[model samples]
Target: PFPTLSPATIDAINVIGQWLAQDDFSGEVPYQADCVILAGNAVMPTIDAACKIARDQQIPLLISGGIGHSTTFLYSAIAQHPHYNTIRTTGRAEATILADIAHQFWHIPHEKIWIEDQSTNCGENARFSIALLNQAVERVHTAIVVQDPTMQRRTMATFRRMTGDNPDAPRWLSYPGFVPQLGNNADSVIFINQLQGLWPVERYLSLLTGELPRLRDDSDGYGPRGRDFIVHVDFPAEVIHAWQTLKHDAVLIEAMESRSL
Candidate 1:
């Protein structure tokens, strides 16, 4: 019973996951852009997706990240990647390791790849990436931005807040590397996609639940009415309902409590 989640709970988790991802190109053809930016994360599927988009579109790829809480995840992911056997992980920033993966494994060339390795958080990621782009000679008129699915919406909002009024800011196209869903099998919750390097269910639930509060525009959030780190986002009715339901779920409460132990 420890990991068993009801169907309703599973559905609620999926709703929150999808809402946070805020994927813009789900059912349609992927949009062409001047460049593709990969936000720092260890999610292998997202990395692959971003790399493919940049390669296929023949656009520049900007990889941004520094050593942070999730840096170890990136290290483990790189170790698991079949094509990445020689990339050194120790003491390197997330952006540097990711750039190596893209350049060496994904075959993206050095000239077409940009790296911002000093940003340790989302706010820094946006600010530093913008500064780097401003100095680039190629001029990015539009960019396809990629991040971990759970942080995609907030990442976009952060970019918007940083560059909304700037005339030189490129149009941002949000493309969460993956849109994860949950399913219940024999009362145990599992990811439908089964992608490698995906977060464990407990961590995934914690992330999904934690995001709603930060995304809220009120005083406790990162929106216009709160810490003012990102643009305001309106939560859909169903998303709110799902979040409320999950917040009150006994299994989720226990999982969260145990996460700190």
Candidate 2:
């Protein structure tokens, strides 16, 4: 079963989801327990699936991650779901930020939601999320991870130490992953001919189930951020000029792409 639902939660989890096969994952635990989970997908349903798992597990903090079609689109999704709010995210990845807004859907209250937009990858998901994941609990015992099933390996692959199998230093509790379906049970996702009104959303349904990750994101990493309605508004001219100059850092982007030149 996705998320590797333990027998301990058989009763409660089953009430929320159906039976599925299980495989014991041999990967080492996350560097630490991540309370506030960050998950990004192409659509809202993916984030919804992740949020459901986080809630079912009684997670105190939850965050959504998804690339921005338009900056206002983030607000649009949040507006649809009252539980979420526009807390600053590193860049886009509006899915988690939207979940915080959706908390109102279940009446989860206003005090326990947060968003981090700076994360551009699974590593950023862990690193940036660590700052806010377990804010509610003083000491996190276990962190519940939620994401698309396709994302498991690439996401989990980051945990292995560069020098060894184990992490030299861990930051949180433990990251236990939970995979959520697109339409969920039936697997409702499909790819359509981009320009045609006949966008076959149904054809991509099965793509949601398999463990195959479709290497996600844009060159900026967290997917394209400011190409659309996301207006860049900053007062300081030097800071803005500095950002504009940095954008041409082709040398740096090349250097950063691989650990070494």
Candidate 3:
């Protein structure tokens, strides 16, 4: 337990976890679709089902993510880890590395995979994946958007904004699961959310305490507030309450202040 957390702060942490918790199989893995776009992250457990789904369905899979914010640990793993890949390059797209792992380790068919090795963030993942889909001879009508479990809601919100007015845009389905939690560290979700590539506590708190709260307001959300990158989703009362509680927490406030310097 973090000694810095007050009783109120501790409860807030639980609330955040409760809010983010999800069943991995809650959303039916689409056996077939236009394609499944896996959002890039440090965690592979998040994308495991998507890969199996694509392979089982015998459909094209578009893995998305450019090297935007890979932790040093993930970079090293991609570069030097034998189980992952011997090929080593920094600033490499997450999709490229993951695509290699998918084919090399998971045995997803090489011919069936397409890589958009240009997206650097979640918004770009959808933006580029859709563009790449259009270049194919077969028109895509729906997309399976696979992402970290905690991000499912925002992924849906982002996809809607990016594919606006496109008649051929496929109904985007969010693959359900919290991709980062491995359960090895029982307290991982309450703190950093992943064991392999641990995000600094400041960054973790910033996301839960900073970015998420803003998502409630369009002007402050992924949309115009965030460069019109993605649309905003309405925050339920629980989310707002939890966000506010976290924002006021002494632990997070102090962490953000120091990290900014």
Candidate 4:
């Protein structure tokens, strides 16, 4: 027999999952942008989708990352590929490695591909990508940012945080393209057991669930009371309450604990 979640818990998890997985494009590829930016992650799924979109739209592609644990995510995916050796030999940034994969695998033209290989986090992905784009092209406006599915909302929110005050900041759009869902069984008691994906399930959930707190504007969050890693973003009441409810969820709580171990 399996443990069952209460009806209330199931509802809360579903609500939180929907909010966290928010996609501005309604599951369609973005149709317009000055250029596309791919934020680095486990690398393959994210880069593959971005390349396909770049090829289709003929929009320039800029993939961004310095180095992070995500390099491990791509380690096996590209272990035998030639680009991995280039990445190895040149000591290129994460963005450059991803760009090579795009060129070799997706046939994105070298002319259309832009690489900002110095960002070590999402915030830097925006900051450096923007700076690089502006430096190369004038009046850059309306950027399409690609990232892991669960990261879509936060990516846009962070872009707003990073550039809102700038009078010339470009409008940002999120294109999660295709990536694994962070969790499953949004409406069931045995939710955690139902989790699915090719990427690291636990790590994905940790990143997905972990970002909610940072989205809040309060002290306990990443706002003024915290490290101010991001600017204040107002969360709706339902989203806030759902985040609180998930704190009591057995699966989520266990995962959070595991992260510290």
The local distance difference test score of each candidate is 0.83, 0.38, 0.62, 0.66
Using all chains and alpha carbons, the TM-scores for the candidates as numbered come to: 0.91, 0.42, 0.74, 0.76
Ranking, TM-score, top scorer first? 1, 4, 3, 2
Model 3 ranges with Cα > 4 A deviation: 1-11, 14-32, 71-73, 76-82, 85-87, 164-170, 179-202, 224-226, 255-261
Off by over 4 Å in 2: 1-23, 26-36, 64-97, 131-137, 159-261
Model 1: runs farther than 4 Å from truth?
23-30, 165-170
Better of 2 and 4 by TM-score: 4
How would you encode candidate 1's per-residue C-alpha lDDT over 1-261 as one tens digit per residue?
337777788888888888888744233434788989999998888988889999999999999999787798789878877767589997899999988878888899999899999998899989999999999897877888899898988888899898773333338888876788988777676788867778777777766777788989999999999999998888889898898888788876886788641
Query: TM-score winner among the candidates?
Result: 1
Model 3 residue pairs with clashes: 66-119, 141-170, 142-170, 149-177, 219-225
The per-candidate count of clashes, in order, stands at 0, 30, 5, 1
TM-score of 4: 0.76
* lDDT, candidate 3, 13-81, per-residue tens: 556544553322224544357677787765455656678777777778888877676434457656545
In candidate 4 the C-alpha lDDT for residue 91 amounts to 54
Q: Is candidate 2 or candidate 4 better by lDDT?
A: 4
lDDT (Cα, tens digit) per residue for candidate 2, span 1-261: 121222322222222221111112333543234354545543344455445555555555556444533234445544444334345444545654554444745444455556666555555565555556445466654554544333443443333211113234433222323322222222322222122111122222223212121222233322223221111112234423333343454542333344321
Q: How do all the candidates rank in terms of lDDT, highest first?
A: 1, 4, 3, 2
lDDT of 2: 0.38
Clashing pairs in 1: none
